Every structure is written in C-alpha cells, then in structure tokens.
C-alpha cells in the first residue's frame, strides 16, 4: 500500500529576544538510515522581515513555505504594498494548514 508521508528528520529552534529573534535549523536531510544531503537549507527568508521553517516531511514543508511566500506576494498586490505583520502572517498560516485538516501537512512550523 502507498504511504504518502515520509520523515526527512532535522530539527529547528526559534528564540525571541527583546529587540531581535533567531530561527535556526540543521542542514541535514535523511530517509531511514541514509543521508540525502549534508546541506539542504530548511529556514527561509519569506519577506517582510519574516523567517520560516517547516520541519518534518520535506515535500509538505516545501509546499507550505512556497504557499506562504505566495500569500505574502498577493498581500502586497491586494493591500497597497502594506507590510505583513508577524501576527497577521501567523493567522494566515493557520488557515493554510487547516485547509488540509483531512490530509495534513506533516510538518511542525515555526516563524
């Protein structure tokens, strides 16, 4: 039987300072006991001073990031190049994830 999910490993870490924030992640990509890549970027600059990482199943993680980056682009078009605040981005991502409540994005996301 076909299993649509997988596990590409990795780990990510977000810490908030007083006037700054960090988002870190390892660059290793894996399946089972094999290494796919020793350098496969996982944390991205999504624009508007926002960084994002979707960790778990890489295919779903790449799709989510790709979709959010797109959401940012259309937010500028539709709302006169307004800056997307971090709280507005978070709420937007909630709706991207719940669109697949019955076929989930197998990722733990941090921005």
């Amino acid at each position: 039987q076909f299993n649509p999910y997988g596990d590409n490993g990795g780990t990510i870490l977000g810490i908030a300072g007083e006037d700054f924030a960090v988002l870190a992640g390892d660059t290793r990509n894996i399946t089972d006991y094999s290494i796919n890549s020793r350098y496969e970027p996982k944390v991205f600059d999504c624009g508007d001073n926002i960084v994002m990482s979707a960790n778990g199943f890489a295919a779903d993680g790449d799709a989510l990031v790709k979709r959010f980056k797109n959401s940012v682009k259309w937010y500028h078009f539709d709302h006169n190049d307004k800056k997307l605040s971090i709280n507005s981005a978070a709420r937007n991502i909630q709706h991207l994830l719940y669109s697949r409540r019955f076929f989930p994005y197998y990722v733990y996301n941090i921005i």
Binding site: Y75, D78, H79, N80, K82, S85, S88, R91, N92, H95
Partner: protein
C-alpha cells in the same frame, strides 16, 4: 432587443450609463473628510407623514472603522452591504487585523461589472464609503456601478449633487474640524432638500479613530441644527 453588455458608439456601456440616471433620481447623500474624522449625512425623504422615518436606514455600518451612505435604488445596496460586511470580517479572520478602507471599497467595486446574459443588470445605487485605517488615515470613497471608485476630500451624490458639489468646492479646506464639517453637511443638505430640514427627515453620522463609526441620535442632530441656525443669523 439588444445585449446587456453592449457598447455605445461613444465607447460607453449603455446599461452602466442608464444606471447613473437612476442614481440622479435618488435622495441626497453627502460626505466630508477631515483630519479629525469623516462625516456622512443623508436626506431621508419620506413619501408620507405616516411612514415612521427612523426606519429609513440610508446610513449603514460595515465595520467598527468603516461606514457607508447610499443614494439611488437603495434596495440594490443590501447585497453590496452584505458582501462588504462579509469581506471586512473575513479579512479579520484570515489576517487578525482591520481591513484597509481602499481594499474594502475595491472588493465592493468588483461586484459592479459582474452582469451579463451572474446578475442580470448593474446596481442602481451609488455608495459613499467612509472609514479610517493606520496606513492612509481618514478616507472617503465614492463607489459607482461602473466598477470605478474615486477617493474624495468631500463628495455629494443624488438629486442635488452638482449644486452641493459646487458648494463643497468653495467650503472645504484641509484644516476643517469635525464640528465644522458636521454643520457644513447640514448646511448643504438644507440648501438642496425640497422639504425643510429637521432631525426627523435628515440623518448625520461620523467615523473617528477613537469611537469608531457612530450614527447620530435625533436629539444630538437637533442641537447641531439649532447651532447652525444661530451662526447663520449671526451675520
């Protein structure tokens, strides 16, 4: 007969141009934008004295930060208001924030040209959309059935529009207060209305950053009418 989406030889859509004639027959609505807020006022125009005038709802809330006045075939506005309210609250759901006045106006204007042979004809009503957001501040828009919307410092629509617009041309300046704008709407409404202006046949409203969108009481408007009469008699 002829198509609903037909162009005239001059390059205009017949049905859109004819809907504009229906809007000219409508009751007068005026909007004035200032740095202290935006004021919206309307002529109620009751067809009979037995008609309870307070049930005439030609000024309407879209969100806490956006209001709306109408003129023309006012029955056509109900679906536009419903869409506007839905759009405003839906954006709040998706983005956890207030929606820009311009973006709300654009969403309403997208409905305009969705007609053909979708709805069977354009809307027969014009809207004055007034509001406030953090980016562009206090704003006033004029939404037509053509799908076009212009921003205005001040604007009048309806039967006494061209006369009122000429008056707004002279009176408006960038340093107007809210109180001054209120009296100015009442002044121009009184000028173009057939019947004598009072608190029962005319309605005021405003939108401020602090208190949001508010429709004025008949008692509150009555005092502003009395304040107007005295200041006109003062010189």
């Amino acid at each position: 007969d002829r198509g609903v989406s037909t162009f005239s030889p001059e390059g205009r859509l017949f049905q859109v141009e004819y809907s504009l004639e229906a809007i000219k027959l409508g009751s007068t609505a005026i909007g004035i934008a200032t740095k202290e807020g935006v004021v919206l006022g309307v002529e109620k125009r009751a067809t009979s004295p037995l008609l309870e005038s307070d049930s005439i709802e030609k000024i309407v809330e879209i969100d806490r930060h956006i209001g709306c006045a109408m003129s023309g075939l006012t029955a056509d506005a109900r679906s536009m208001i419903e869409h506007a309210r839905t759009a405003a609250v839906t954006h709040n759901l998706y983005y956890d924030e207030d929606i820009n006045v311009e973006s709300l106006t654009q969403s309403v204007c997208d409905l305009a040209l969705r007609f053909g042979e979708l709805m069977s004809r354009p809307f027969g009503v014009a809207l004055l959309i007034a509001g406030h957001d953090a980016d562009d501040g206090y704003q006033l828009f004029h939404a037509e059935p053509s799908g076009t919307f212009y921003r205005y410092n001040a604007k009048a629509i309806g039967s006494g529009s061209e006369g009122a617009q000429a008056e707004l041309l002279n009176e408006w300046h960038s340093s107007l207060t809210l109180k001054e704008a209120e009296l100015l709407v009442l002044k121009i409404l009184k000028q173009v209305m057939e019947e004598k202006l009072d608190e029962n046949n005319a309605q005021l409203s405003c939108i401020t950053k602090q208190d949001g969108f508010k429709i004025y009481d008949n008692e509150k408007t009555a005092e502003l009418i009395k304040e107007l009469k005295e200041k006109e008699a003062a010189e």
